[PDB]
From Swiss-Prot, chains A, B:
It is a lipid-anchor. This is Ras-related protein SEC4. The keyword ATP-binding does not apply. The gene is SEC4. GO terms for cellular component: cellular bud tip; endosome; extracellular vesicle; incipient cellular bud site; mating projection tip; plasma membrane; spitzenkorper; transport vesicle membrane. GO terms for molecular function: GTP binding; GTPase activity. Belongs to the small GTPase superfamily. Rab family. It comes from Candida albicans (strain SC5314 / ATCC MYA-2876). GTP binds at residues 13-20, 54-58, 112-115. It is found in: Cytoplasmic vesicle, Secretory vesicle membrane; Cell membrane. Involved in exocytosis. Maybe by regulating the binding and fusion of secretory vesicles with the cell surface. The GTP-bound form of SEC4 may interact with an effector, thereby stimulating its activity and leading to exocytotic fusion. SEC4 may be an upstream activator of the 19.5S SEC8/SEC15 particle. SEC4 probably interacts directly with SEC8; it could serve as the attachment site for the SEC8/SEC15 particle. The chain holds residues 9 to 184 of 210 of the full protein.
Amino acid sequence: RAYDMIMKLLLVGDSGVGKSCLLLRFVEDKFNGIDFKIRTIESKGKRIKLQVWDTAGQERFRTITTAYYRGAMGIVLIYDVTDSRSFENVENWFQTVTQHANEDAQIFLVGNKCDDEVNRQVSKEQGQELAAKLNVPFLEASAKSNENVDSIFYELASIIQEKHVEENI
Amino acid sequence: RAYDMIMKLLLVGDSGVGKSCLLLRFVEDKFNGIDFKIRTIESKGKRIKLQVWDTAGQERFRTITTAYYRGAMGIVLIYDVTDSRSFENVENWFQTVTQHANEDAQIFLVGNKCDDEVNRQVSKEQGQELAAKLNVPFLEASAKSNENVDSIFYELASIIQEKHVEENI
Ligand SMILES: Nc1nc2c(ncn2[C@@H]2O[C@H](COP(=O)(O)OP(=O)(O)O)[C@@H](O)[C@H]2O)c(=O)[nH]1
Ligand SMILES: Nc1nc2c(ncn2[C@@H]2O[C@H](COP(=O)(O)OP(=O)(O)O)[C@@H](O)[C@H]2O)c(=O)[nH]1
C-alpha cells in the first residue's frame, strides 16, 4: 500500500539541546547543516511518511526562512532539561514559530536529555507547567536512552491526523 | 558540504498527463499513490535538495489537502500537448493552486509529451500563449525523450532561489 499521508515535522530549539540527536535516534535508532530525514510509521492503520526537519541552526543572523515554517504540520519545540537557560528561551521559540507557522500547525513541547539526572536543572513538572500554559502537549525524552523518542512523533502524527485540514472543492 | 536550501516542488495536472513519469524521469532518469521523491541539484553554486511531490491524484472527491499546497515553493502545472481537453482544464488548476498556495510560491507551466508529434493537439505557441497570460514561465517537455525535463526543475529552483523570503528577526 502506498502512503496515506505525508507530514512535515519541524524541530526547533537552541543549539546543543539535542535536535540532530533526536532526529538520528528516531530515524536511524542511533546515538552519537540543513537537511530532512524520513521515517515511515503507522498511525491508526494509516501509513504516514514522516518528514523531520532540522533547520533552526543554519539560518542567517536575525532572519527566518518563512517557507520552511510553512507547510510544516508539526513543530517540536525542544529544550534541555539539564540547561535551564534553554528552557527559559522557549518563550522566544514559541513566539517565533506561532508567528510564521500556520494556524493548523501543531506544536509539541519536548524536554530532551531526560536521562542526565545528575545534571538536571529543569524539573519534569516545570516542563508540564510551561506546556499547559502554551496549550501544547508535553513529553520528556532522551536521544541517549531512546525514552519517549518514538512517542514524540507518533503522538504528534496522531494529532495532525485529527487536526489537518481537507477543505472542500 | 551540507545542503544550502530545501525546495518543496508540487506537481499538478489532470490524470494521465505524465506527472509520475516526469517525476520518474527527473529523479531516476527512466521512462515507463501519495509520495515525494528527492534529487540533489546545484543552482548558482548552491546545493539544493529538491522535494518533488505527486499528490494531485489521490485527493478525496471535491476536497484539497491544504497543508500539501502550503510550504510548496514551486508548483509545476502540467498538461498534455496531445490532449487539448487537458490544456483547457489548466484554468481550473491555476485557480485552485493560487487560492491555496502562498503568495511567494512560483508557478511553472509545462506541456508534457512534446515527443508525440503525431498526436499533438495543442501547439507550442498555444502553451506559450497561456503561460504569458497567467504570468508564469513555460517549457514543453517529455518524460520519454528527456527533453527539457531537467530544465523544468532547474529553472524553477533558480526562480525560487531569487524569490524565496528570508524575513528579518
Ligand atoms: N545525555 C544526553 N545527551 C544528549 C542527548 N541528546 C543530545 N545529547 C548531547 O548533546 C550534544 C549536542 O546535541 P546536538 O545534537 O548537537 O543538539 P543540536 O545542536 O540542537 O542539534 C551531543 O554531543 C550529545 O552528546 C540526550 O538525550 N541525552
Ligand atoms: N509519449 C509520451 N508519453 C508519456 C509521457 N509522459 C507520460 N506518458 C504516458 O502517459 C501515461 C500516463 O501518464 P502518468 O504518469 O500516469 O500521468 P499522471 O497520472 O498524471 O501521473 C503513461 O503510461 C506514459 O506512457 C511523455 O513525455 N511522452
